[PDB]
Amino acid sequence: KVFGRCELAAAMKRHGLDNYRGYSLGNWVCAAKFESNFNTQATNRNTDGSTDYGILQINSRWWCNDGRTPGSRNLCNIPCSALLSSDITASVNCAKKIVSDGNGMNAWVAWRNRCKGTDVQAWIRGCRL
């Protein structure tokens, strides 16, 4: 499913992401925009053989099991395919563990390079939250 900007903002808010670990809602919407262009079905293969999955492009080397990333940990305890669902619950629950890991949202390259330090509030402007 390809989410609308405000539609995703509302879903993320409902799942407890607004201000989780100190990151305002605008940060999560910005990260999703640049990681997957709001598409739950996005996948991207990395040079190391791992693959990024879903709305928040969660990596198979540490977070989920895709059966083809040799020697990977499955820290969120879920198959990577679960992250491509139209229901963002699994992606949200796993993202919460990722962001608590120590590097915060810097774990997401697109957030660090395109969202960090920008006016993230613009991503939720106009939405009925």
Residue appearing with tokens 């990977």: 72
Radius of gyration of the chain, Cα coordinates, nearest whole angstrom = 14
Residue 77 pairs with which residues in a beta bridge?
A: none
This structure's resolution (angstroms)? Answer: 1.8
Count other C-beta atoms under 10 Å from residue 11's C-beta: 16
CA distance 98 to 105: 8
Q: For the chain, what's the residue count?
A: 129
Do 98 and 107 meet the contact criterion of CB atoms below 8 Å apart?
Answer: yes
The count of domains in the chain is: 1
Hey, which bits of the chain come out as E strands? 43-45, 51-53, 58-59
CA distance 127 to 56: 21
Nearest alpha carbon to residue 124 among 33, 35, 55: 33
Domain that holds residue 71: 1-129
Instruction: Give me the catalytic one of 48, 52, 66, 119.
Output: 52
Task: Please indicate whether residue 52 is annotated as part of the active site.
Answer: yes
Do 127 and 75 meet the contact criterion of CB atoms below 8 Å apart?
Answer: no
Task: Please indicate whether residue 18 is annotated as part of the active site.
Answer: no
83: tokens are: 């992250």
Dihedral angle, C-alpha 64, 40, 109, 114, nearest 10 °: -160
Q: Tell me how the structure was determined.
A: X-ray
Q: How far from the centroid of its chain's Cα atoms is residue 100's Cα? A: 13
CA distance 119 to 116: 9
CA distance 127 to 129: 6
Secondary structure letter of residue 114 according to DSSP: H
Residue 44 pairs with which residues in a beta bridge?
A: 52
24: tokens are: 């305002």
CATH number at residue 43: 1.10.530.10
101 is in an annotated binding site: yes
